Design a protein around this ligand. Structure first.
Ligand SMILES: Nc1ncnc2c1ncn2[C@@H]1O[C@H](COP(=O)(O)OP(=O)(O)OP(=O)(O)O)[C@@H](O)[C@H]1O
Ligand SMILES: [K+]
Ligand SMILES: [K+]
Ligand SMILES: [K+]
Ligand code: NA
Lengths: 288, 288
């Protein structure tokens, strides 16, 4: 009334949404990949992005400290998600590698650990996925291709880097508690909000990192054997690696060097440590 | 508390006349961008609506880059913080006399193109970068380490993947127009708001992807020669390829197959036409 026009040059309407910083801090203990959690393993360390926070990273470092009091080293940004409660909440995830001084990855993602063959839980997951892919005929062919590429429903090799794609398919198929399907079906331990979605991106990032350049000095002690180096990468990838081919990748990437002490002990080169100190949190990558 | 305004920013890249070009608005002054709104189902779907409304140019797959936050002062006037979310997309450039203009990557980042040798502008950049590094002795040593690692002075040479880290250093040093330094110093064509920071992220992403697995079928025509593919990667990297190592890489990765047809080059010699084999197209499709 009294001319309240639609758009107005002297009026700017700004949309706001909740900004949540979420932390995926990973450590390797007893050849088991383990993630920092709060609320008795139901949530990741998280907190809102506030005015007093100088940066996103420094803001998350305060929440990690207040909620865990566990020191963290370098951080790298993962993925940014809109809520699926696309409305009110924007979540920003970060990955960190530390030495444990905690819950396991495969408590939340038991189907991702193939170190001792395929997990038998995958038979039930595939059975539910085939029923969902066959539920609507016009989308049957595409859903079978997605389920084959991710889980290998009608065959197809297992790709460990597709942790996120596998969790997104289970969510769309209503096979995880976070989807909240009418008959609730769930595999693995669920988490608060979409924290398992965040964790999936951290597992995918680490696995993609260790396949072409395993810069994991923060996960190891200062000295280690090459077989200890293989055991922890095998724990991260959820696969058993070939000895000969793993030795070639490490020497090819000039990552480690002999310390002279005794199997031979190795340490990551100082150049690898110095480059990481200057690379920041927005690393040049190929996927994320 | 914990609110933020999200701007979705698009880096849509095409390769025309062996030159990498980015889609822009306002006659090359800004990238296509728009706020994230409540009705936007996802961050990617929200940006697609801004791309269409502002350019009306078709866009294929989109890949999230990184999220940046503001360092402003009176964000409390806005009700929350301000963040920027970038996305990278590869398309074929299309003329249509909508309003949108295609500009080359290196109009904004001239120091990133080393195809014709190291550019001369880097001599003026390194000079002003040293003067900034020597201005404050307590931080001189650390600033020289950042200047050596980012701008090729390291000894390891020029790293084309560090496009964002180079630009961020130039911003902190007050060597770009977006810094608004007390004496204005700028290299390359500036952009609106922080969009040149977003473009540097997309350039770094593409260069890291093509180094490991150049899945660039969206940038190429349906069929192409191997020389056309090499010129495309070279334009993206700002470097000249090792021909034999590049041919060996795309064969090991099983990326392109012969179409059976022939093409006559400019000089007059015929050459086999290639296409990205279907398995490469299907893998990129089975995601998001
Ligand atoms: N708008 C901007 N455009 C370009 N560079 C910027 C901008 N704002 C800050 N920078 C620079 O970017 C660098 C990184 O700061 P930023 O606020 O992005 O987060 P950060 O946690 O310090 O990053 P990192 O530790 O990953 O380098 C700093 O050198 C800063 O001066
Ligand atoms: K919040
Ligand atoms: K950051
Ligand atoms: K502020
Ligand atoms: Na740069």
């Amino acid at each position: 009334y009294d001319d309240d026009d639609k758009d107005h040059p002297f009026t700017v309407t700004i949309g706001l949404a909740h900004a949540e910083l979420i932390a995926v801090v990973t450590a390797i203990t007893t050849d088991e990949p383990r993630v920092m959690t709060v609320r008795e393993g139901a949530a990741l360390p998280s907190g809102p992005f506030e005015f007093g926070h100088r940066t996103l990273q420094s803001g998350l470092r305060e929440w990690i400290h207040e909620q865990t009091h566990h020191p963290v080293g370098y951080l790298e940004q993962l993925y940014t998600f809109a809520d699926r409660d696309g409305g009110r909440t924007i979540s920003i995830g970060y990955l960190g590698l530390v030495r444990e001084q905690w819950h396991g990855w495969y408590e939340y993602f038991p189907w991702e650990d193939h170190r001792q063959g395929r997990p038998d839980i995958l038979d039930s997951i595939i059975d539910k996925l085939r029923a969902w892919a066959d539920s609507e005929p016009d989308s049957r062919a595409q859903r079978h291709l997605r389920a084959d590429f991710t889980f290998g429903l009608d065959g197809g090799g297992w790709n460990e880097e597709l942790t996120l794609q596998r969790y997104e398919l289970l969510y769309e198929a209503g096979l995880v508690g976070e989807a909240q399907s009418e008959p609730r079906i769930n595999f693995g331990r669920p988490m608060f909000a979409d924290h398992r979605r965040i964790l999936a991106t951290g597992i995918a990032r680490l696995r993609a990192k260790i396949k072409y350049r395993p810069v994991v000095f923060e996960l190891m002690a200062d000295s280690f054997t090459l077989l200890q180096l293989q055991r922890a990468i095998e724990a991260l990838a959820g696969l058993t690696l070939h000895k000969q081919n793993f030795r070639r990748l490490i020497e090819q990437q000039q990552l480690v060097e002999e310390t002279g002490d005794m199997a031979k002990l190795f340490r990551f080169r100082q150049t690898v440590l110095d480059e990481r100190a200057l690379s920041g949190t927005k690393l040049p990558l190929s996927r994320n």
